[PDB]
Amino acid sequence: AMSEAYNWKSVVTGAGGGFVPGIIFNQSEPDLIYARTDIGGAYRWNQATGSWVSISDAVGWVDWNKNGVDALATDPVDPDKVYMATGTYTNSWDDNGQIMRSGDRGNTWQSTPLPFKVGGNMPGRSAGERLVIDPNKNSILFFGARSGNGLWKSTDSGVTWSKVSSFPNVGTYIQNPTLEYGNDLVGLSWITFDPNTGTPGNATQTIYVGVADTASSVYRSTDGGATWTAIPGQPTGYLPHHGVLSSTGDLYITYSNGVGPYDGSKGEVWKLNTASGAWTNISPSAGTDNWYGFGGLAVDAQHPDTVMVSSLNAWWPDEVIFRSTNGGATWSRIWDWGSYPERSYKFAMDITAAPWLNHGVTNSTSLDPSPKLGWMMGDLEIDPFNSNRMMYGTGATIYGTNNLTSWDTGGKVNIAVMAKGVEETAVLGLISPPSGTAHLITALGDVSGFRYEDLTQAPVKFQTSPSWATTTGIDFAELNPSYVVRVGGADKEKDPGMKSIGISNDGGVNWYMPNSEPSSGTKTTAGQGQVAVSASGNSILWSTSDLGVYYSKTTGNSWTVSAGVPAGAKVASDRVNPNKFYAFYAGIFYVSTDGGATFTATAAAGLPANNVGGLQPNQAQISMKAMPGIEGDVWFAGGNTVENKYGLWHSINSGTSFTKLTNVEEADLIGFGMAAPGQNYMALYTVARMDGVRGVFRSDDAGASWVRINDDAHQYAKINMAITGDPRVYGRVYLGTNGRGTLYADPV
Ligand SMILES: [Cl-]
Ligand SMILES: [Cl-]
Ligand SMILES: [Mg+2]
């Protein structure tokens, strides 16, 4: 099981590109901050570099659900210690979560299984804090769980966990109650200690818990969690999102009529004076002036009469942050209406670290700000050692400021991208062109994808004309690589004239939309699917998501149904012969020699069919590519264990027959890069299991032997997304992920 040392690095996006539901400051050590994501693990801040370091890259293929980080706690007594509650909801039986523990700030981890599921991907994932460490006796932790599992506790520093049977209310609210197998209780929403009620080494006695139950949502124990009471006088009707106890004694709570991160059309903010028992409604807006939940909540530890909250979600014209310096008695908004439609602003956005966050819309107007302040602002935090620093997560990035108190003196708060080092995108495709200025073009969920000349530079340009959220396929003409085609999902309710295909003749720098798209009767395709471009660029083959496979030899001025190939097929172009395309579906390989107009099933046998047991079409793992420079040389990776058809196959006769490589016991992806010096065949790059070892492997000898090029510290979870080499850089691999962005790596 030979390995070769490689340097693994992120292809930079600057902003991260996904949802950050939690930012967690340590309450005792200045500049110790963590960030948790829903699909891509967690991070620790580095003040010296102003950037984040992943603490999750050892998570691998089997244990991938550890990157669903539902909660995180950082120990205020021993700040080397950090813990996380991780897992996702799936359909699988026994897909339980775990509590992970680290004694070195997340450099290394140990894990304890829980007997129930954790929902790092589920609604309410930005509520918190749901995992907490007792600030007086740090061997005590509590976890507020989903699905009726209630309140759980450890008294041995997270090693073993047990249910707190006396907790009286496991939750009643369900986001989707009549939904089939989505009948799941949200559960507990947050836990907050009163640190004045313990002493060093002795358990904190007063604990507050918020529960997703609109009729009874706030509980207190005064005996360390032995017994619990619903607090008298509490408000009813809404769902608590955060509860923060200021050192003044005021417990602040944000409420919404949803749990987040999307739903929330009404909300309130309350405080409880914990000494006097009096509750006050301090909501910044009410009635028809409130059309959003309140989500994020922060108290300024250095100035604990200062509190801020965010909308979740106001949507239009933007979100709102509200700031009070008098305990909620009065609030200032971060923007106000002037003479309508104009607005006045207390902030300025700086996206120089990720200029694509303007989405290619350069003019920022009052009713259409670009960039927006944010969205999905479920978590807002003030640095407990610096009242001038705030950070918040959005659905795309982490924003923050270092001049927050300028708000109070009439200056503008400068809000900048504060996500350097974070990469959270899901990668649907990668191409590395063999000439031109770009080494890589990515196809991404949510933020479309980007073109790189320099892999270390945050993209300047968002992909527009067409503009969409998710690129599902991309290809280029091998023998005319300036010609690039991407397909995706245009949002036609927002822009009825947007197309789901974009074409470039300048290498992907600028795009245009063709005059037509595939249609059937009165139905025009919704797009998506996969695309292949002929070697010359004279034909585009689009395996649409909804209408099946179409081709165009007219640059998209018209589209014609392809004969002989089933809807949903995987498609690929020959890299030499412009008339030759390949397709694959359900264990059948197809070839066209008329530019995609007609396909024939070949005699190729033994490829996986994805049609046994319960297997669903979204489960099919298939990676099929033809080799640059050699007509009819086709590699295929994928399959599964239930069919006993999993591995890497090679054809040298245009798919007429395939031979399974006997030295690759499972494989999921294949890609090619520059031949090694002295060798005559392009290097191969695969995601595979080799003799029991899962990883990323390179072959310099056409698959006769393989060397592992990742390692146990650089695994990136379920890496079944995309891989390619670089035709101009020997040894370089580009690896897609589902939640860690794109990596590039080169031999040491
Ligand atoms: Cl958290
Ligand atoms: Cl949420
Ligand atoms: Mg937080």
The CATH number given to whatever domain includes residue 64 is 2.130.10.10
Structure tokens at 451: 């073109």
User: For residues 559 and 502, is the Cβ–Cβ distance under 8 A?
Assistant: no
**Residue list, CB under 5 A from ion ligand 3:** 379, 381
249 token code pair: 């004694």
**Spatial CB neighbours of 388, under 8 Å, sequence gap ≥ 6:** 401, 402, 403, 404, 405
Contacts 24+ apart (CB under 8 A), 457-461: 457/12, 458/12, 458/13, 458/14, 458/15, 458/353, 458/354, 458/355, 458/356, 459/13, 459/14, 459/354, 459/355, 459/356, 460/355, 460/356, 461/355, 461/356, 461/360, 461/509
For residues 88, 92, 94, 96, the Cα torsion angle rounded to the nearest 10 degrees is 0
What would the 3-class secondary structure string for 397-446 be?
CEEEECCCCHHHHCCCEEEEECCCCCCCCEEEEEECCCCCCCCEEEEECC
Take residue 621 and report the two structure tokens written for it. Answer: 């793992």
Report the separation in Å between the CA atom of 73 and the middle of ligand 3, taken as the mean of its atom positions.
10
Give me the residues paired with residue 69 across strands. Answer: 86
Spatial separation of the C-alpha atoms in residues 536 and 577, rounded to whole Å: 8
CA dihedral 563, 567, 572, 576 (to 10 degrees): 10
Query: 296: CA distance to ligand 3 center in Å?
Result: 8
| Two structure tokens written together for 530 | 């996969």
Sheet with 207-211: strands ordered across = 188-193, 207-211, 218-221, 229-230
The rounded Cα 222 to chain-centroid distance in angstroms is 39
Whose atoms come closest to the Cα of 19: which ligand?
Answer: 2
Copy the structure tokens of residue 426. Answer: 């899901």
| SS3 category, 196 | helix
Kindly list the strands in the beta sheet with 549-552, ordered across the sheet, starting from the edge strand earlier in the chain.
530-533, 540-543, 549-552, 560-561
Question: Does one domain contain both 509 and 403?
Answer: no
Helix, strand, coil in percent for the chain, rounding step 5: 5, 40, 60
Q: What is the DSSP letter of 510?
A: S
Q: Please report which residue ranges of 569-641 form alpha helices under DSSP H.
A: none
Would you say 219 and 176 are in contact if contact means Cβ atoms under 8 Å apart? no
d(CA 482, CA 486): 13
Give the resolution to one decimal, in Å.
Answer: 1.4
Residue 138, CA atoms < 13 Å, CB-side half-sphere: 17
Give the start-end residues of each E strand in 90-221.
98-102, 110-113, 131-133, 141-144, 151-154, 162-163, 188-193, 207-211, 218-221
Q: How far, in Å, from the CA of 128 to the mean position of ligand 3?
A: 7
Find the radius of gyration of the CA atoms of the chain.
27
Q: Which two tokens stand for residue 695?
A: 């990883």
Beta bridge partners of 583: 571, 590
- Omega of the bond leading into 317 within 30 degrees of 0 (cis): yes
Asked whether residue 379 is marked as a ligand-binding residue, the answer is: yes
End-to-end CA distance of the chain: 18
Q: Rounded to whole angstroms, what are the CA distances from 401 to 369, 388, 405?
A: 19, 7, 10
Q: Do residues 9 and 27 share a domain?
A: no
Same domain, yes or no: 558 and 435: yes
From residue 580, give the alpha-carbon distance in Å to each of 9, 181, 482, 539, 577. Answer: 36, 45, 20, 10, 6
For residue 263, the ligand closest to its alpha carbon is 2
Q: Alpha-carbon distance 412 to 188, whole Å?
A: 38
What is the DSSP code string of 293-341?
A: EEEEEEE-TTSTT-EEEEEE---SS---EEEESSTTSS-EESEEE-STT
The residue among 385, 402, 424 that closes a domain is: 424
The pair of structure tokens assigned to 3 is: 């390995």
191 and 157 in a common domain: yes
E strand or H helix at 393, and its extent? strand 390-393
User: 218: helix, coil or strand?
Assistant: strand
H-helix segments, 428-538 = none
Residue 167 per-residue DSSP state = -
CA distance 563 to 591: 11
Q: Compute how many other C-beta atoms are within 10 angstroms of the C-beta atom of residue 288.
A: 6
Residue 346 has which token pair?
Answer: 């207390």
Domain tally, the chain: 2
Are 729 and 711 part of one and the same domain? yes
Of 64, 67, 65, 89, the C-alpha closest to 718 is 64
Q: 261 C-alpha to center of ligand 1: Å?
A: 14
Q: Are 232 and 218 in contact (CB under 8 A)?
A: no
Residues 254 and 216 in one domain: yes
Q: How far is CA 361 from CA 365, 372, 487, in A?
A: 10, 11, 21
**Same-domain status, 445 and 360:** no
Ligand 3 center from residue 120 Cα (angstroms): 15
Residue 653 lies in domain = 1-16+425-748
Closest CA to 605 of 565, 567, 643, 548: 643
Which secondary structure element, helix H or strand E, spans residue 21, and what is its range? Answer: none
DSSP lists the bridge partners of residue 550 as 542, 561
Triad 26, 106, 735: Cα angle to 5°: 125
Q: Specify whether 444 is located in the same domain as 346.
A: no
Q: What's the burial of 555, exposed, middle or buried (CB within 10 Å: 0-12/13-18/19+)? A: middle
C-alpha separations of 85 from 21, 59, 155, 158, 536 in Å: 13, 14, 16, 10, 51
Q: If you measure from the C-alpha of residue 378 to the centroid of ligand 2, how many angstroms do you get, rounded to a whole number?
A: 6
The answer to whether the beta carbons of residues 404 and 387 sit under 8 Å apart is yes
The answer to whether the beta carbons of residues 88 and 40 sit under 8 Å apart is no
Is residue 419 within 8 Å of 427, Cβ to Cβ? no
Which listed ligand is nearest to 296 at the C-alpha? 3
Distance between CA atoms of 133 and 723, rounded to whole angstroms?
Answer: 41
Contacts of 217 (CB under 8 A, 6+ apart): 189, 210, 211, 234, 236, 238, 239, 240
| 607 and 511 in a common domain | yes
What does the alpha-carbon distance between residue 688 and residue 94 come to, in Å, rounded to a whole number? 25
Q: Which residues surround ligand 2, an ion (CB under 5 A)?
A: 124-126, 260-261, 378
Eight-state DSSP code of residue 125: T
Q: How far apart are CA 365 and CA 379, in angstroms?
A: 26
Report angle CA 508, 509, 513 to the nearest 5 degrees.
65
The catalytic residue positions are 38, 446
Final residue before a domain boundary, out of 391, 424, 457: 424
Q: Where are the beta strands (DSSP E) in 577-663?
A: 581-585, 588-592, 600-601, 622-626, 634-640, 645-651, 659-660
* Omega before residue 466 within 30° of 0, cis: yes
- Report the largest interatomic distance among the alpha carbons of the chain, rounded to a whole angstrom: 83
For residues 580 and 672, state if they share a domain: yes
Q: What tokens were used for 152?
A: 């759980």
Q: Are 509 and 460 in contact (CB under 8 A)?
A: no
| Range list of β-strands (E), 183-225 | 188-193, 207-211, 218-221
Q: Residue 674 Cα, ligand 3 centroid: separation in angstroms? A: 46
- CB-based contacts of 165, cutoff 8 Å, min separation 6: none
CA 198 to chain centre: 38
- How far apart (Å, rounded) are the C-alpha atoms in residues 505 and 198? 68
Residue 240: partners with Cβ closer than 8 Å, 6 or more residues away = 127, 189, 190, 210, 211, 212, 217, 218, 253, 254, 255
Residue 595 and residue 550 share a domain: yes
- Angle value at C-alpha 358, between 356 and 363, nearest 5 degrees: 140
Domain end call among 424, 457, 479 = 424
Under 8 Å between Cβ of 589 and 549:
no
Residues 392 and 438 both lie in one domain: no
